[PDB]
Ligand binder design. Structure first.
Ligand code: HEM
Ligand code: HEM
Lengths: 381, 393
């Protein structure tokens, strides 16, 4: 049953922004297909069926010991009621009011990230200078990491995930986590105006150091990876189809749902973590036996009408429907922060470089392994 | 979010734990298969240039090589994990410096002196079981009763205090509520801080007084407290789980333990065989490679991790006849207490408790049996955790 998680990864590659032919074949086969098999690994590609799976109380997101021991603060490895307690304690850091009040700082992050790019001059790689820069600075600011330490903290996170020397990965992972631990200690003594502080002032000794460090490490990792990769993919979409984003730039009021369409089209997290069934559960016409796993294809759901015309990127589309942030109890806790950064950074780029385009538009943009990972994006203006 | 499969240390801890579940007393088929493959196999690899590999060592000699090598670190793994937040987290020189100061408390002469007290603890626990009447759960009534009392006596906690103090320590590590964790932790700490202050005024006969006499200045209060908490928490857990699994083995194979009770001098190494067969701590903490090392027919790169299967080493000939429990086996070999600089500090205490309590049980209840012979015994997550053991006699 473990090879079936490798198999899922293969189906979520991309032909530029499009899903690959292998996935399309499964999509047209039906809403729910077998990946492998008396236990069965299923892929859910139907919009309705995915929602049924992700919102059912007869599935667990657990791999298998209590989540808190090996995965403290890694929410998508908790089941209720432990999941419910921990998510309740961190959720107020992501409430609408705190997100609105964060918006001015996120605006400055994008403006300064754009001030650096213009000074450097075209052409220039937007993967590090726009994607990575905005994402890590915004996420560090949200956590209250002092500005003087962010560059080195962000460098150690990146090195821990990508370094070509395994030895240097270990050292960087240790550097990163020690810093997150020290942040937890400073909050416990003197809670500030940030995620750490908000959690500790509301709950205090109810949340443990392991939980708090765990959640903070997760938010840093999610913020740095998810937001950076999305912003890189957004800049590429801007370069590829600039007339649609000129409409955003000049007449944003006529396209109030624009961000949902970009999210739908790009789908930079293509699939959810496998869910294991705990009762026999009818899902559509299909029977999922207790012990089966179901992986949900968020790409399949959001791009369900590919390759027909209506699936093509249309920024004026009325109320775009997507499941890009999942569904049910594990739906993305960070959605409001991610969306704030995208709402701010994407139009800030359009206003700043209306004449944005690919430097070297002859050659293909190289993509890494999924999830959707633009490795370099050389743009001029 | 974050894909849990990209969490290198955590995902491979999980995979290693799954491999060290048990089918009654035996290794599961999945570990058996890896054992047959060779002395070292992969748990998993990060899929990128520079990606690290998590390895499982199952070969006896290869495990001794890994664990005696200076090119592996215990500290560097848990420092890259949110899960990693006493002695096993240290490398030399910190490891050496702390371990030398506490080692005198676990010396041979010290265990000889404690033996009469351990005999009394066993007899008291067995009297209480007898007074309850069958069927009795041997997990709380034999395993934990003996483990808690013997470990607290070793620390010199007065009998009146032991129940409350052990409860406090367990609360602080256990509860979901983090408020009750801090309250219980502070109750434990305030007691130990007084005990430390008392010891430093006049060193006594227990663990604290021995240490403070030989190394009083050079060891801190926090270090003393930390060692006590390990002995009372994790140490006691290890001992309780072993005694519960021992009692199960005795009920399961009464004829071999009848040999222990009637002709104990014919089976001088009996305890080494019981320990080998049961292997109630199935694996070591994962170590990070700090240099490249060739082991088996593989190259472990610096930054790769290795987890050693003590179960695999101890049960290396499973399922052949020679691996079966045989209390008369001459000089049984095992690595149940690890190897190299991190080898069990409490081995001699653990063995004294087992050497005393197991014969005591065999003599008291020669008719010991499962209460519900056909009902399966439920095992918790690794390490070897008998959840309930209803015995009668
Ligand atoms: C600062 C940015 C982000 C943070 C802090 C964040 C945080 C989280 C957290 C904590 C969860 C787990 C919630 C739970 O289990 O209860 C989660 C789940 C999820 N996030 Fe995010 N996230 C971020 C950005 C993104 C982005 C940009 C996407 C997609 C484009 C995304 C997609 C998801 C999905 C699909 C899940 C559900 C996973 C599943 O059910 O298996 N996240 N996120
Ligand atoms: C009163 C009982 C016990 C105490 C106080 C105790 C104490 C300790 C301590 C302090 C260490 C760390 C040593 C270091 O890093 O230098 C250790 C390691 C170890 N102990 Fe124990 N122990 C006890 C019982 C047991 C039992 C019953 C077993 C097995 C059946 C066991 C197996 C181990 C193993 C395998 C290690 C090494 C782990 C590794 O290298 O990663 N111990 N013990």
């Amino acid at each position: 049953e473990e090879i079936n998680v490798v198999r899922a990864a293969e189906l979520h590659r991309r032909d530029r922004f499009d899903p690959v032919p292998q996935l399309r074949s499964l999509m047209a086969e039906g809403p729910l297909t077998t990946l492998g098999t008396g236990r069965t690994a299923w892929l859910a590609t139907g919009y309705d069926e995915i929602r049924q799976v992700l919102s059912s109380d007869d599935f667990s997101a657990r791999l298998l010991t209590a989540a808190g021991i090996t995965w403290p603060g890694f929410l998508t490895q908790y089941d209720p009621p432990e999941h419910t307690r921990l998510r309740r304690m961190v959720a107020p850091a992501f409430a609408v009011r705190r997100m609105q009040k964060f918006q001015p700082q996120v605006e400055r992050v994008v403006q300064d990230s754009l001030d650096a790019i213009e000074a450097l001059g075209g052409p220039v790689d937007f993967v590090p200078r726009f994607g990575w820069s905005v994402a890590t600075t915004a996420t560090c600011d949200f956590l209250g990491i002092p500005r003087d330490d962010q560059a080195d903290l962000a460098r150690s996170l990146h090195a821990s995930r990508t370094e070509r020397s395994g030895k240097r990965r270990t050292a960087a992972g240790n550097k990163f986590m020690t810093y997150m631990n020290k942040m937890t200690a400073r909050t416990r003594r003197d809670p500030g105006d940030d995620m750490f502080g908000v959690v500790v002032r509301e709950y205090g000794d109810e949340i443990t150091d392991a939980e708090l460090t765990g959640v903070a490490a997760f938010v840093m990792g999610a913020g740095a990876d998810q937001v950076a990769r999305f912003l890189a993919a957004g800049a590429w979409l801007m370069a590829d189809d600039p007339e649609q984003f000129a409409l955003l730039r000049e007449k944003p009021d006529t396209v109030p749902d624009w961000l949902d369409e970009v999210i739908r089209y790009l789908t930079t997290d293509e699939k959810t973590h496998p869910r294991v069934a705990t009762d026999d559960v009818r899902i559509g016409d299909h029977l999922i036996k207790a012990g089966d796993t179901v992986t949900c294809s968020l790409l399949a759901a959001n791009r369900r009408n590919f390759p027909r015309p209506e699936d093509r990127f249309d920024i004026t589309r009325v109320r775009p429907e997507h499941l890009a942030f999942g569904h049910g109890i594990h739906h993305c806790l960070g959605r409001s922060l991610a969306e704030l950064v995208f709402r701010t950074a994407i139009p800030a780029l359009a206003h700043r470089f209306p004449t944005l385009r690919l430097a070297e538009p002859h050659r293909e943009i190289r993509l890494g392994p999924p999830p959707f990972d633009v490795e370099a994006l050389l743009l001029d203006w």
